[PDB]
Amino acid sequence: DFSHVFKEFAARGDWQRSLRLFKYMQRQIWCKPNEHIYTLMIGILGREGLLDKAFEIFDEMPSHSVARTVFSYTAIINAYGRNGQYGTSLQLLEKMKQEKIIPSILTYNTVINSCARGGHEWEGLLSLFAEMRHEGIQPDLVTYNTLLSACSSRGLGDEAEMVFRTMNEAGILPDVTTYSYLVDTFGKLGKLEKVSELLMEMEAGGTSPEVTSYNVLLEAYAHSGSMKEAMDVFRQMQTAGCVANAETYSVLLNLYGKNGRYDQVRDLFLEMKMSNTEPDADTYNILIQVFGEGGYFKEVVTLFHDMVEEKVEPNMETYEGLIYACGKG
């Protein structure tokens, strides 16, 4: 019941009441706090940024005859990493190793994440992974997603290629998360064909590729000047079949504005429109801008009749262009 109350207080952020209850139970013989209550209090203190109080509570454990477990070490490592203290996490890992405490897969993953977020060299992450492998750590799906990122965090071109291939070459791939992060890394270096691959890898895996996923790659794909590739990616996203908010179309259309087929614009509109994905305040503004640059001002007026009927409300930029249209008209 004490642990349940502590968890409920940590869910609401009542660190003060939890600390008071812990300090009161510490003086009670019938309610002596155990290692679980100490870990819960340390986590509650770390969630609020009370590193000093958490450290004091962790140090008072031996005076209270409370057992210490890798759990507390992993919690301290995660608390240090959340503030960018990668060196402190490495020192805590070394101290735990000196204390004959066998590190777990979660502790190694937390240390790798802390090193990645703190700006440590990719060589350090590779050495940490090699050490974890030499001490027989166990792979996990969540760890694998964060591991695909490890190379991405480094940002090296070779690392970016390895980040993506880590899943493909060994033959084990997370359906969505690994593909997204690897695609992100592939992009800065330049996913030359890695872009087609990233969607293909996620899609035929046995899980249909995510729409948001299709879009994130797609948006950069536009930055890439990928147009036929992105169009193909759009027909490909169309192949994906994942339900998509008109926002995914919106982004691509905006690039297509420079393309200005102007009937390409027309066609896409009908389909997203009748697909229960009414154009967004954003999409309407984009459409007005795209049409306006290439004329069709009468059409611009028409969009006003249309927006009103839809009942989606206008916005500052929205009203604005509509007036420019009138003016040029």
Automatic annotation (TrEMBL):
Portion of the full-length sequence here: 102 to 430 of 860
Sorted UniProt keywords: Repeat
One GO CC annotation: chloroplast
Stated family: Belongs to the PPR family. P subfamily.
BP GO annotations: plastid transcription
Protein known as: Pentatricopeptide repeat-containing protein At1g74850, chloroplastic
PPR repeats: 34-68, 69-103, 104-139, 140-174, 175-209, 210-244, 245-279, 280-314
Organism name: Nicotiana tabacum
Tree of life domain: Eukaryota
Gene that produces this protein: LOC107789959
Repeat keyword on record: yes
